[PDB]
Protein backbone atom coordinates (compact mmCIF):
# COMPACT_ATOMS: atom_id res chain seq x y z
CA UNK A 1 0.00 0.00 0.00
CA UNK A 2 2.71 2.65 0.98
CA UNK A 3 5.33 1.45 -1.71
CA UNK A 4 3.32 2.13 -5.02
CA UNK A 5 1.43 5.29 -3.64
CA UNK A 6 4.62 7.33 -2.61
CA UNK A 7 6.49 6.97 -6.04
CA UNK A 8 3.73 8.18 -8.55
CA UNK A 9 0.73 10.18 -7.17
CA UNK A 10 1.02 10.52 -3.25
CA UNK A 11 -2.64 11.05 -2.10
CA UNK A 12 -2.96 9.53 1.43
CA UNK A 13 -5.74 11.58 3.29
CA UNK A 14 -7.99 12.27 0.15
CA UNK A 15 -8.23 8.48 -0.76
CA UNK A 16 -8.81 7.27 2.94
CA UNK A 17 -12.18 9.23 3.27
CA UNK A 18 -13.50 8.07 -0.24
CA UNK A 19 -12.30 4.70 -1.75
CA UNK A 20 -8.58 3.70 -0.81
CA UNK A 21 -6.68 0.30 -0.73
CA UNK A 22 -9.02 -0.90 2.22
CA UNK A 23 -12.39 -0.41 0.25
CA UNK A 24 -11.04 -2.67 -2.68
CA UNK A 25 -10.44 -5.68 -0.20
CA UNK A 26 -14.18 -5.66 1.01
CA UNK A 27 -15.53 -6.64 -2.55
CA UNK A 28 -13.17 -9.74 -3.03
How far apart CA 28 and CA 23 sit, in angstroms, is: 10
Q: Rounded to the nearest 10 degrees, how much is the dihedral formed by the CA atoms of 6, 9, 10, 15?
A: -120
- For the chain, the distance separating the N- and C-terminal CA atoms, rounded to the nearest angstrom, is 17
| Closest residue by Cα to residue 10 from 2, 21, 25 | 2
How far apart CA 12 and CA 10 sit, in angstroms, is: 6
How far apart CA 20 and CA 10 sit, in angstroms, is: 12
Helices and strands, number each (H, E), in the chain: 3, 0
Phi first, then psi: give them for residue 25, nearest 5 degrees.
Answer: -60, -30
Method of determination used here: NMR
Amino acid sequence: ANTWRAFDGPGAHRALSGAPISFIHLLS
